[PDB]
Write an enzyme that holds these catalytic residues in place. Structure first.
Site, PDB file in Angstrom:
ATOM      1  N   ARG A 106     103.288  27.174  86.191  1.00 49.58           N
ATOM      2  CA  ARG A 106     102.369  27.103  85.060  1.00 49.58           C
ATOM      3  C   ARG A 106     101.957  28.387  84.335  1.00 49.58           C
ATOM      4  NH1 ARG A 106      97.818  23.417  87.357  1.00 49.58           N
ATOM      5  NH2 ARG A 106      98.756  24.054  89.359  1.00 49.58           N
ATOM      6  N   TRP A 275     113.062  25.535  83.942  1.00 49.53           N
ATOM      7  CA  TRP A 275     114.149  26.107  84.720  1.00 49.53           C
ATOM      8  C   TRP A 275     113.803  25.950  86.205  1.00 49.53           C
ATOM      9  CZ3 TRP A 275     111.661  29.337  80.946  1.00 49.53           C
ATOM     10  CH2 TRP A 275     110.648  30.171  81.448  1.00 49.53           C
ATOM     11  N   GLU A 280     114.332  24.726  95.472  1.00 51.43           N
ATOM     12  CA  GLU A 280     114.598  23.340  95.122  1.00 51.43           C
ATOM     13  C   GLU A 280     116.077  22.993  95.313  1.00 51.43           C
ATOM     14  OE1 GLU A 280     112.465  21.909  91.557  1.00 51.43           O
ATOM     15  OE2 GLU A 280     112.519  24.027  90.965  1.00 51.43           O
TER      16      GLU A 280
HETATM   17  C1  HEC Z   1     108.701  27.322  83.327  1.00 51.95           C
HETATM   18  C2  HEC Z   1     109.609  26.837  84.445  1.00 51.95           C
HETATM   19  C3  HEC Z   1     109.097  25.882  85.552  1.00 51.95           C
HETATM   20  C4  HEC Z   1     109.242  26.018  86.887  1.00 51.95           C
HETATM   21  C5  HEC Z   1     109.933  27.165  87.666  1.00 51.95           C
HETATM   22  C6  HEC Z   1     108.615  24.832  87.468  1.00 51.95           C
HETATM   23  N1  HEC Z   1     108.066  23.987  86.509  1.00 51.95           N
HETATM   24 FE1  HEC Z   1     107.079  22.287  86.797  1.00 51.95          FE
HETATM   25  N2  HEC Z   1     106.173  20.424  86.919  1.00 51.95           N
HETATM   26  C7  HEC Z   1     105.662  19.605  85.957  1.00 51.95           C
HETATM   27  C8  HEC Z   1     105.047  18.365  86.538  1.00 51.95           C
HETATM   28  C9  HEC Z   1     104.396  17.266  85.735  1.00 51.95           C
HETATM   29  C10 HEC Z   1     105.185  18.469  87.938  1.00 51.95           C
HETATM   30  C11 HEC Z   1     104.741  17.513  89.065  1.00 51.95           C
HETATM   31  C12 HEC Z   1     106.057  16.885  89.242  1.00 51.95           C
HETATM   32  C13 HEC Z   1     106.432  16.193  90.513  1.00 51.95           C
HETATM   33  O1  HEC Z   1     105.523  15.657  91.308  1.00 51.95           O
HETATM   34  O2  HEC Z   1     107.605  16.230  90.676  1.00 51.95           O
HETATM   35  C14 HEC Z   1     105.924  19.768  88.124  1.00 51.95           C
HETATM   36  C15 HEC Z   1     106.331  20.308  89.336  1.00 51.95           C
HETATM   37  C16 HEC Z   1     107.034  21.495  89.632  1.00 51.95           C
HETATM   38  C17 HEC Z   1     107.457  21.920  90.985  1.00 51.95           C
HETATM   39  C18 HEC Z   1     107.267  21.140  92.324  1.00 51.95           C
HETATM   40  C19 HEC Z   1     107.751  19.654  92.305  1.00 51.95           C
HETATM   41  C20 HEC Z   1     109.019  19.378  93.077  1.00 51.95           C
HETATM   42  O3  HEC Z   1     109.750  18.431  92.693  1.00 51.95           O
HETATM   43  O4  HEC Z   1     109.285  20.083  94.079  1.00 51.95           O
HETATM   44  C21 HEC Z   1     108.081  23.123  90.841  1.00 51.95           C
HETATM   45  C22 HEC Z   1     108.721  23.985  91.960  1.00 51.95           C
HETATM   46  C23 HEC Z   1     108.053  23.444  89.424  1.00 51.95           C
HETATM   47  N3  HEC Z   1     107.396  22.431  88.713  1.00 51.95           N
HETATM   48  C24 HEC Z   1     108.608  24.598  88.844  1.00 51.95           C
HETATM   49  C25 HEC Z   1     105.784  19.854  84.589  1.00 51.95           C
HETATM   50  C26 HEC Z   1     106.369  20.979  84.039  1.00 51.95           C
HETATM   51  C27 HEC Z   1     106.515  21.164  82.601  1.00 51.95           C
HETATM   52  C28 HEC Z   1     105.995  20.158  81.563  1.00 51.95           C
HETATM   53  C29 HEC Z   1     105.772  20.420  80.105  1.00 51.95           C
HETATM   54  C30 HEC Z   1     107.173  22.357  82.434  1.00 51.95           C
HETATM   55  C31 HEC Z   1     107.617  23.052  81.112  1.00 51.95           C
HETATM   56  C32 HEC Z   1     107.419  22.868  83.794  1.00 51.95           C
HETATM   57  N4  HEC Z   1     106.940  22.020  84.768  1.00 51.95           N
HETATM   58  C33 HEC Z   1     108.067  24.084  84.056  1.00 51.95           C
HETATM   59  C34 HEC Z   1     108.392  24.610  85.322  1.00 51.95           C
HETATM   60  C1  LIG Z   2     114.444  17.788  89.699  1.00 54.84           C
HETATM   61  C2  LIG Z   2     113.277  18.151  88.778  1.00 54.84           C
HETATM   62  C3  LIG Z   2     111.978  18.652  89.525  1.00 54.84           C
HETATM   63  C4  LIG Z   2     111.554  19.635  88.496  1.00 54.84           C
HETATM   64  C5  LIG Z   2     110.008  19.443  88.205  1.00 54.84           C
HETATM   65  O1  LIG Z   2     109.880  19.623  86.749  1.00 54.84           O
HETATM   66  C6  LIG Z   2     110.373  20.773  86.088  1.00 54.84           C
HETATM   67  C7  LIG Z   2     110.238  20.892  84.679  1.00 54.84           C
HETATM   68  C8  LIG Z   2     110.758  22.005  84.249  1.00 54.84           C
HETATM   69  S1  LIG Z   2     111.445  23.006  85.482  1.00 54.84           S
HETATM   70  C9  LIG Z   2     111.006  21.832  86.666  1.00 54.84           C
HETATM   71  C10 LIG Z   2     111.360  22.091  88.098  1.00 54.84           C
HETATM   72  N1  LIG Z   2     111.443  23.340  88.517  1.00 54.84           N
HETATM   73  N2  LIG Z   2     111.646  21.077  89.007  1.00 54.84           N
END
Ligand code: HEC
Ligand SMILES: CCC[C@H]1COc2ccsc2C(=N)N1
Ligand code: HEC
Ligand SMILES: CCC[C@H]1COc2ccsc2C(=N)N1
Ligand SMILES: [Cl-]
Ligand SMILES: [Cl-]
Ligand SMILES: [Zn+2]
Lengths: 399, 401
Positions: A106, A275, A280
């Site tokens: 975030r 990304w 993961e």
């Molecule tokens: C800038 C790069 C970026 C990275 C690195 C990133 N995210 Fe997330 N991300 C989420 C949400 C919603 C969850 C909770 C998802 C879940 O329970 O899988 C999450 C969960 C995650 C998780 C843990 C969930 C898992 O499946 O293990 C990781 C690690 C992560 N994000 C990394 C919405 C976002 C959005 C939405 C506009 C963006 C852009 C985003 N995320 C960008 C990123």
């Molecule tokens: C397999 C997708 C899980 C995804 C959660 O959602 C986002 C969204 C942008 S990057 C990212 C991530 N690092 N992992």
């Protein structure tokens, strides 16, 4: 007001934001369930969303503010719903991400490209929209965060839905012998695509076609031009035999099965992407025993001793697999961040958010990486988990 | 509605009906979860009645005359003295449930085999020290560790309590060197200084065993030194990295918590040290690699000759892993009981299965049950858990000073 302490450094704070939690969670004073994976109300939520917005542009209590409020209320009273303004949609999307308790990435919440596909009318259109999203976000390897919002849920009309959990994922074929070729996590969706007319492949890394759904229509199958799907072959900097294992992964992580909730409005279809954080892929996708489960084979090749758990052969192999993923992605010039750099940046995020809103919803269990947990800063940081809106939410499968 | 617990690796499902009987209240509320926070008259009689019922229920004699008499008996004792006393058989039972109910304990499969020593007849700090030394001997048992607990006099109305000021029976001193740094274990800086303030003449090593600060009711803490021949220790060496041994690192064999409060049937025991044995990750990962602890990660990554210039090479992960290997290697070599996180977590899954059949649930703190390194490589990571507080229990209590 919950007191939050970091045990590595010793500093403490007070989550005053928690107090303003919108919805209720699973926990009660009788027992904690934090480790579980899963009209007048429309107006209230909408009024609050409008307030956050006019507060975001320092125009709170203005004439524009009050008119925007009356207009939304007029609309709801007449149609049961209301349409957001472009600027609001953009602002909403960012907040949803900002409020995601499980996202460790975030620090980047403000840099999000928003595509407005609220005029989408067919599956064929959905596809064109998705492909442009993939092209933009992939950006030849220098990934850019983005979200595409499709039409909102409607009174008297089916929802738009993307059946796939991700825009890009590999097929999982149940072999006869109970095994699975490909990603075991995707057997159901793989079978659904076949059930709908898709002749499958037989590889371990077949990109699945998309199952797109327009309102009240059966889903339609689409195939992503391979040209659009960027991938990374996996190799190791010194373990020469690794490359020969023929493993790889796609560059774009794009969640497409969650719902976007803004001011009482729901978007069943709003795919977002950014990304990957190496664990993961290195730890979860490749090492979970119910995923590609390559941990043992890798160890044997590392000529390690798998007879006794105490040799920590598992930890060794996992660490090397995570190195390969990091090495490989950097080699192919594809964005990716390791668990250390990512957690460090998140500590920074918590800090900014404390000054900004006086707290930050966070899910300890999801923020801490699947390996070397205590070696990262977040492990020694207490967190408070709560639901704020706008937000991204889970929803039942369309089938 | 009972909570639905799912295992995501296997897909198996159970329901925790045991949580609806949770005795104490937790920090979480439907508004926000605080799961990760480290520190979360007629009331006594209702707690005693419940405990007595748990007891008679355990020997399958619930509802007998002996059961009723025991209930009436404690009620009269309370009416007369404002408190009551347990029978040996109950104390033993209680201490065991207390371990069994500890949410943060991954070594719970062994709960039924706890040896309970009754020191409720302790009259002074000197006797406490004798009991503690005996416990240490019995428990250490030359390396073949045995689980045990020694219960000292209960908290009393109009009278001070027995307390062992140290958080553990065996800890290493922490000397705040002049320049910011700390010689020894940074975690024991405060307790180290209190031992000095109370007449202890310090050392200057990195692993100096601390003296015990024992408190008798209404008495300033007396100081005592543990006979070195009592404190079994392990010199750390790596199986292939020959230079490891030269780092002169070591750790004691006996993990003994001594600052928690044991609660049974509304009764409180401010002093009741317990011990078992270590899980490798506790020494190699937490005590040796925590930046605010011995924090030795960089020095080792360097000797391993790894590129510490960039985080992306996972040099920290590599160094830590080897250190954990060293700990395991050294203990197995020194014939001292120890268990790695793969075996510990695997057995805990068995314990969950045993408890589901026994009480329809198991209170578990996911964040503490999952090991500090290699989380998702162990089976507990993929297991959903419900956290609640059942009594008897081991609880945290404020420092006596
Ligand atoms: C800038 C790069 C970026 C990275 C690195 C990133 N995210 Fe997330 N991300 C989420 C949400 C919603 C969850 C909770 C998802 C879940 O329970 O899988 C999450 C969960 C995650 C998780 C843990 C969930 C898992 O499946 O293990 C990781 C690690 C992560 N994000 C990394 C919405 C976002 C959005 C939405 C506009 C963006 C852009 C985003 N995320 C960008 C990123
Ligand atoms: C397999 C997708 C899980 C995804 C959660 O959602 C986002 C969204 C942008 S990057 C990212 C991530 N690092 N992992
Ligand atoms: C059979 C060997 C054994 C192993 C291995 C074991 N325990 Fe525990 N254990 C506890 C309590 C209470 C906690 C939670 C303590 C805390 O927060 O410090 C705990 C916590 C733990 C933790 C996590 C806390 C940390 O410091 O990281 C581990 C690992 C653990 N126990 C391992 C009472 C016991 C008792 C008491 C009769 C016995 C015996 C016991 N434990 C025996 C064992
Ligand atoms: C530093 C001591 C923490 C201790 C928690 O308490 C027990 C009690 C018996 S073994 C054990 C353990 N593995 N770690
Ligand atoms: Cl993934
Ligand atoms: Cl310890
Ligand atoms: Zn909770």
């Amino acid at each position: 007001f919950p007191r939050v302490k970091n045990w590595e450094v010793g500093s403490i704070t007070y989550d005053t934001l928690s107090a303003q939690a919108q919805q209720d969670g699973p926990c009660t004073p009788r027992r904690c369930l934090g480790s579980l994976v899963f009209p007048e109300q429309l107006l209230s939520q909408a009024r609050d969303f409008i307030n956050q917005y006019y507060s975001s542009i320092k125009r709170s209590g203005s004439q524009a503010h009050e008119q925007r409020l009356q207009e939304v209320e007029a609309e709801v009273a007449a149609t049961g719903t209301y349409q957001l303004r472009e600027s609001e949609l953009v602002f909403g999307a960012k907040q949803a991400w900002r409020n995601a308790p499980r996202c460790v990435g975030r620090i980047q919440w403000g840099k999000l490209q928003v595509f407005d596909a609220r005029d989408c009318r067919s599956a064929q259109e959905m596809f064109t929209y998705i492909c442009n999203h993939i092209k933009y976000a992939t950006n030849r390897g220098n990934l850019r965060s983005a979200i595409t919002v499709f039409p909102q849920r409607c009174p008297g009309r089916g929802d738009f839905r993307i059946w796939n959990s991700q825009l890009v994922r590999y097929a999982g074929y149940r072999q006869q012998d109970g095994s699975v070729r490909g990603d075991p996590a995707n057997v159901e969706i793989t079978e659904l695509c076949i059930q709908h007319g898709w002749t499958p492949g037989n590889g371990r890394f077949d990109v699945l076609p998309l199952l797109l759904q327009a309102p009240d229509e059966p889903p339609e199958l689409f195939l992503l031009p391979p040209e659009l799907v960027l991938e990374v072959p996996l190799e190791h900097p010194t373990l020469e035999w690794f490359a020969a294992l023929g493993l790889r992964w796609y560059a774009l992580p794009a969640v497409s099965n969650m719902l976007l909730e803004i001011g009482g409005l729901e978007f069943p279809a709003a795919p977002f992407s950014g990304w990957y954080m190496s664990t993961e892929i290195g730890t979860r996708n490749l090492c979970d025993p119910h995923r590609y489960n390559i941990l043992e084979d890798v160890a044997v090749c590392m000529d390690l001793d798998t007879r006794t758990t105490s040799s920590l052969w598992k930890d060794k192999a996992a660490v090397e697999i995570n190195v390969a993923v990091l090495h490989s992605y950097q080699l192919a010039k594809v964005t990716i961040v390791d668990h250390h750099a990512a957690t460090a940046s998140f500590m920074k995020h918590l800090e900014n958010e404390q000054k900004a809103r006086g707290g930050c919803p966070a899910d300890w269990a999801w923020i801490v990486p699947p390996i070397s947990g205590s070696l990262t800063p977040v492990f020694h940081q207490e967190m408070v988990n709560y639901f704020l809106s706008p937000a991204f939410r889970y929803q039942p499968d369309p089938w």
